[PDB]
Amino acid sequence: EPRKVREFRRREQEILDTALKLFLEQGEDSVTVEMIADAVGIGKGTIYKHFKSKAEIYLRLMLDYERDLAALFHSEDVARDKEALSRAYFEFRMRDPQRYRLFDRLEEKVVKTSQVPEMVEELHKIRASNFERLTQLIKERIADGKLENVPPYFHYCAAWALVHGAVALYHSPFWREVLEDQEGFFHFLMDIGVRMGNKRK
Amino acid sequence: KVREFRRREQEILDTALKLFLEQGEDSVTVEMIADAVGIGKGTIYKHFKSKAEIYLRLMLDYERDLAALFHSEDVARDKEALSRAYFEFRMRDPQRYRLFDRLEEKVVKTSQVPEMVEELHKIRASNFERLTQLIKERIADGKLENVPPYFHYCAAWALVHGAVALYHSPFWREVLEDQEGFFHFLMDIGVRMGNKRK
Amino acid sequence: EPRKVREFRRREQEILDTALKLFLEQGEDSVTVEMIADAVGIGKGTIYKHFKSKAEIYLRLMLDYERDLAALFHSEDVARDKEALSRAYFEFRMRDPQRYRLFDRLEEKVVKTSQVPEMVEELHKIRASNFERLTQLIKERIADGKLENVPPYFHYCAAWALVHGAVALYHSPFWREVLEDQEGFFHFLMDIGVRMGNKRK
Amino acid sequence: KVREFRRREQEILDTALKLFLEQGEDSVTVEMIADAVGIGKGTIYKHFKSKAEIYLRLMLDYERDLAALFHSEDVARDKEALSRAYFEFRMRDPQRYRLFDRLEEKVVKTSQVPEMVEELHKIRASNFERLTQLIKERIADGKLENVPPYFHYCAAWALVHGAVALYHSPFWREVLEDQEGFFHFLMDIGVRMGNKRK
Amino acid sequence: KVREFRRREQEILDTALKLFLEQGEDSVTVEMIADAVGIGKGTIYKHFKSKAEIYLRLMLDYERDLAALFHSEDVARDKEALSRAYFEFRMRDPQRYRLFDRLEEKVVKTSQVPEMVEELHKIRASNFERLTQLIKERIADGKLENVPPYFHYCAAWALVHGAVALYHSPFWREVLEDQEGFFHFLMDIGVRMGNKRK
Amino acid sequence: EPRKVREFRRREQEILDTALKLFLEQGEDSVTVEMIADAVGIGKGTIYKHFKSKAEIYLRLMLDYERDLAALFHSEDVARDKEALSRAYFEFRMRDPQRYRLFDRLEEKVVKTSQVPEMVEELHKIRASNFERLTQLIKERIADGKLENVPPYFHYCAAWALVHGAVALYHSPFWREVLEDQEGFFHFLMDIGVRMGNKRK
DNA sequence: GACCGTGACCGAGACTAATGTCTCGGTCATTTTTTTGACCGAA
DNA sequence: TTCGGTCAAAAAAATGACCGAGACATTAGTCTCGGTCACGGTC
DNA sequence: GACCGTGACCGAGACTAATGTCTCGGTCATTTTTTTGACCGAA
DNA sequence: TTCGGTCAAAAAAATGACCGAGACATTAGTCTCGGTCACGGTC
């Protein structure tokens, strides 16, 4: 058979790049979803033939956020042994931070609104499921003892606070510019991931 | 007149203190705010002199209690507790910052009193330097990393700025807040400050 | 709480609380109006537009003392335990022996001389009410069987006698300094005044 | 001879006693004294010095009967009898109590005749001595709770002061003038101050 | 539509490349190529009907790669390394070159679409003239032998064709079908040509 | 010397040389044996003496090839100088392309049929011995240092490609019309052939 | 006691008349494959 | 005044398929191969 | 050799006529002390 | 929506201040204190 498997795959890859080049600061509350259709490599048209104003594999682009997560989970690296997972998770999370800003536009218009319920309620469902899957690793970590033997939502909520703090940090009017020209913050990210909710004799 | 006014002013202090810890919502002007202690319209003016300048004086008296809790008079054993008690102050009664978020996004008319706001910003930087100076003391301890410690400032600042949204914006803490083992873990962080490596 | 609540209540309350310890120093002809006003932190026009002359002040003070003794009488409920009630009575009456001896002096000074007939009559009638209240307490004491079974005015007079003699004990030149601040013998007197009338089978 | 002078002195003393009980102490100079006695003016001064000597000799004879009272003769000396007799002698005749209370600050503490004053203080101390001796005699077999003796002293002090001042009240003495059952009540509960379970 | 067109064209080219490399040219036709294509025989027909549309397309693309190879970007271009890349571009995948010569001597005789062949010889002359100017450039500095350029043109074509015949001779093909050492040996000999004997 | 021996020798020689030219003209398949006989013009009974048939053609042509290689092996000079023999061999291999073409035709119809591929194995053994002598005098000159330290078969295949390139170029219907009257092109080819594979100081 | 080189005759790989079968898909037709722009609602 | 999420479709995109030309491969009369008995010369 | 108890006389702490000086601020007046509700603009 | 930041003021709030009553404290004639020479009785 022909690379029609590969052709739909590379549609999703060109769209991994297309939605990206839009959404480096665009979202949906910042760009009209049908005009996001207009805004891309293919016309608005094939974004309603292949898609429905980004939809048919933008639901999947958000699931591909959730999959760069759910495939980190089953990390293709043979190790997938310990904290290297949640570390790379945080690293993934804290990039093109308009990241939580884009999901904040989604929070404005579609998420708890469920304007695409086909996107966001399924997202809520199975991101809670996959949340409990990373939390299942972190149950393997509570088995490791490297992390505390307290509930796992303890450690999760600490991580959510820490990550949202990273995001909102790079939004502070002038209490971020001291940092914004500093990438010793990235060794600090290494130290965050290695040694938060962690062990210390 | 002398201790008359002192009792008056500490009454003012504790009044706004409790009232901004827990008393405020979508609020008509200080005919609701300072009428929380049943006063009137110009009773606000014997008192506070503001139909709606308490829609910043909430923040200003808050910032004054801030100014006070920036005590550099800790006895011994430098804790970073300028930082940690500031974080405590903010997050303890997390509904304190819920009410800050609320009343702010109710009343916030972009840029209130420039004069007060910028003197605030001034001394905020100054007490940021006092905070950073307790960090300088633990740099005298060699206990915190010798960096430009606006690093440390910002890091724990955001550690709590996210505690606010994890407690406010419905996500997962509000699902498992019923069990305040998580606030007990905030407390554990409160007590497990900078433990040496055994 | 509002405006003139504040002005009225603050002025009069601290006026009273100044004149109290002023009299505990010296007395009531020794201490006088201008002393009291100047000792507050304010002046005598607060006074002279609240109370002009000393008799009004004394009557205010004494019916305030009587309202304090009323709150003392108000033993709420629960069988109205009278042991600790008599205890509090003797303490409230004996503490600051300068205070009770001052009111005894003021009886002969302003009351027996009867400066202000109106508030004097008010005190007479409410004293009838308070004598009735203490009589009621004594009646329920005798009903309980603690006290000796006799009329109640017996024990009314006996309690007044013990209180007066005990404040005199903290006013004599002989054993005042031995007992004016000895909490041990103060409580001893309170026990003797609370363990009175008891049955002896 | 000796008995004639003795009875003359006793007549002068009781005459002046009734006078000072009736009239007073300051305006009652020797005028009323020798007007009532009348045996002879110089013949009255054959026996006494003035009003002041008569005051202090009355107090002397009072304390003489008191010293006659204090005694510990019985083998089975159950001290309830001496205790009740002391309570009676203290509380009986409240007019005598008011009298000597006036005479004290009139002539004693002024001490126009100080030898009798120091003898009064002497016999005060001696009555105190026998009282404490009696208290420890009671405590000997365990017949009281363990408290100081001066506790009981000042307790009886307040008791008798209350009694005399109550029967000298402005109004309630009008009610108690005919109440000897109240006196029996006073005696019973004055015998029953501060006791422990057997 | 458009990018769909790119898809079909590129797939058809690579498919026919593989098939022809294995089986020569009379064997391979529209249908082996359509099957390996998978997206059709009309995919072949409606784009490429005959068998030599493919050959002309292929060899003109090959010579366009040869022209991009002969870069005029570097004015002081390393002509020796460019000649190395030329020899490698033409010699690599030798069975590709034997396929090229097979189709060459086929359609030089048949010439299904002669106008494409007129264009081909014209554009070949154009590339050869650029090559010729570059031979003049590398003769001027004194690396090649000072003779007419087309001498070196025919010499390079002969050397590549002979190396291909070597990479299909039944004796030394297996000795040198993948001798990268001998491949670079051939390249350096063809590139160090015309150098004056020191 | 041998009157009759030389007679028969030159008879075979001239007959099969006439044949060589006949098949440079027409070919070896269409032309049969007594065609060669009537071409030469001797008693064809004498023609059939030679070997048997077209086998005569193939056989003695490979024999002439063998005798050329026999002359090519070794010459006479002090140290048996290398450049002269090398250049002469380069020339002769790059000489007379149609001769080599018809020899390829003979090779093809020798191994296609099964008359005598033994002469083909003889060609390969004389090839091997000539290559061995090539390596031998190459190393004789490298005694003082002549060619770089690469294999000898490297230079073998280099000269192979060179000779085939020359022959195929002068066979190419496009450029042969230009270079057919260019012996300067042959001189250039020889300069290329002698200046390859040599070491550099 | 031996042998070179050509005048007298006739039968078969191929050539030249007479025949026969391929090459893949070309020109067709079929289903079909990413590929606009409107076409409606939320905040 | 900020955007939020939906259907029919070309031009040819993906499966075949009668009927196409001019060219190998034999095979009879011969081409032109493929042969000799018999007749001339020398130690 | 000694001494108890009362008829004959006259001079002074206080009482009773005659006078004289306090108590603090009371009823006044002064300045005065936290104490509404409108009265305007921002975003 | 959705709030943001300003002046005159009572009722008496804070300083005095003539003119207030009925009560200690002496002091002359005496109250009534304060005294005796001189005259009666016993070992």
* Distance separating alpha carbons of residues D4 and A139, to the nearest angstrom: 119
Chains with ≥3 CB–CB distances under 8 Å to C = B, D
Residues pairing with F147 in the sheet: F198
Residues pairing with F198 in the sheet: F147
* Distance separating alpha carbons of residues A148 and A154, to the nearest angstrom: 9
DSSP per-residue letters across A84-119? HHHHHHHHHHTSSSHHHHHHHHHHHHTTTTTSSHHH
Question: Which residue is the nearest neighbor of H6, CA to C1'?
Answer: A52
Q: How would you class E63 by CB atoms within 10 Å of its CB: exposed for 0-12, middle for 13-18, buried for 19 or more?
A: middle
Taking an 8 Å cut-off on Cβ atoms, the answer to whether F164 and E159 are in contact is no
Q: Could you tell me the CA-to-CA distances from C80 to C73, C137, C193, D11, E187 in Å, in that order?
A: 10, 9, 17, 58, 120
Give me A87's structure tokens.
């570390």
8 A C-beta contact, residue C186 and residue C196 = no
Q: Please report how the helices F118-142 and F54-73 are oriented relative to each other, as an axis angle in degrees rounded to 10.
A: 10
Q: Work out the number of other CB atoms within 10 angstroms of the CB of residue A70.
A: 17
Cα-only R_g, chain D = 19
* Distance separating alpha carbons of residues B132 and B149, to the nearest angstrom: 6
Interatomic distance A51 CA / H6 C1' (Å): 10
Task: Indicate which of B144, B151, B161 best probes the interface with A, i.e. most A CBs within 10 Å of its own CB.
Answer: B161
Q: Do chains F and B touch (3 or more CB pairs under 8 A)?
A: no
DSSP per-residue letters across F70-127? HHHH---SGGG-HHHHHHHHHHHHTS-HHHHHHHHHHHHHHHHS-S-THHHHHHHHHH
* Distance separating alpha carbons of residues A178 and B132, to the nearest angstrom: 14
Q: How far is residue B63 CA from its own chain's centroid?
A: 7
Deposited experimental method: cryo-EM
Question: Which residue is the nearest neighbor of H16, CA to C1'?
Answer: E41
Interatomic distance F32 CA / H26 C1' (Å): 21
Q: Work out the number of other CB atoms within 10 angstroms of the CB of residue F74.
A: 13
Taking an 8 Å cut-off on Cβ atoms, the answer to whether F161 and E166 are in contact is yes
Check residue E39 and report its DSSP letter: S
Among partner residues D158, D179, D182, which is closest to C189 by beta-carbon distance?
D158
DSSP per-residue letters across C135-192? HHHHHHHHHHT-S-SS-HHHHHHHHHHHHHHHHHHTTSTTTHHHHSS-HHHHHHHHHH
* Distance separating alpha carbons of residues A153 and D9, to the nearest angstrom: 106
* Distance separating alpha carbons of residues E54 and E43, to the nearest angstrom: 13
* Distance separating alpha carbons of residues E86 and B146, to the nearest angstrom: 59
* Distance separating alpha carbons of residues C90 and C72, to the nearest angstrom: 10
* Distance separating alpha carbons of residues B135 and B143, to the nearest angstrom: 9
Check residue C196 and report its DSSP letter: -
Residue C101: CA count within 13 A, CB half-sphere: 19
Of all residues in chain B, the one with the smallest CA distance to A104 is B169
* Distance separating alpha carbons of residues F94 and F165, to the nearest angstrom: 9
Check residue A75 and report its DSSP letter: -
* Distance separating alpha carbons of residues F65 and E8, to the nearest angstrom: 54
Give me D174's structure tokens.
């009008």
Q: What letters, b where the CB count within 10 A reaches 16 and e where it falls short, cover D125-150? A: eebeebbeebbebbeeeeebeebebb
Amino acid type, D135: I
* Distance separating alpha carbons of residues A2 and A58, to the nearest angstrom: 25
Q: What is the resolution of this structure in A?
A: 3.6
3-state SS class at C28: coil
Check residue D104 and report its DSSP letter: I
Amino acid type, D17: L
Chains with ≥3 CB–CB distances under 8 Å to E = A, F
* Distance separating alpha carbons of residues B52 and D14, to the nearest angstrom: 89
Interatomic distance B89 CA / J3 C1' (Å): 28
E37 contact A CB<8A: yes
Taking an 8 Å cut-off on Cβ atoms, the answer to whether B154 and A168 are in contact is no
DSSP per-residue letters across chain B? -HHHHHHHHHHHHHHHHHHHHH--SS--STTTTGGGGS--SSHHHHHT--SSTHHHHHHHHHHHHHHHHT-----SS--SHHHHHHHHHHHSSHHHHHHHHHHHHHH--SS--HHHHHHHHHHHHHHHHHHHHHHHHHHHTT-S--S-THHHHHHHHHHHHHHHHHHHSSSSTTTS-SSTHHHHHHHHHHHSTT----
DSSP per-residue letters across F39-67? HHTS-HHHHTTSSSSHHHHHHHHHHHHHH
Q: Positive or negative CA dihedral for F73, F77, F79, F83? A: negative
| Residues in chain A closer than 8 A to B154 (CB atoms) | 169, 172, 175-176, 178-179
Cα dihedral: D120, D121, D125, D131 (round 10):
50
Amino acid type, E155: A
| Residues in chain C closer than 8 A to D158 (CB atoms) | 162, 165-166, 168-169, 189
Contact positions of strand G to protein Cβ (< 7 A):
4-6, 13-15, 23-30, 33-40, 42-43
Tally the residues of chain A.
201
Q: How far is residue D139 CA from its own chain's centroid?
A: 26
* Distance separating alpha carbons of residues A34 and A45, to the nearest angstrom: 10
8 A C-beta contact, residue C12 and residue C57 = no
Residues 6 or more apart from C132 whose CB is under 8 A from it? none
* Distance separating alpha carbons of residues F20 and F16, to the nearest angstrom: 6
* Distance separating alpha carbons of residues D31 and D27, to the nearest angstrom: 9
8 A C-beta contact, residue D66 and residue D123 = yes
Check residue E49 and report its DSSP letter: -
Interatomic distance D29 CA / J23 C1' (Å): 21
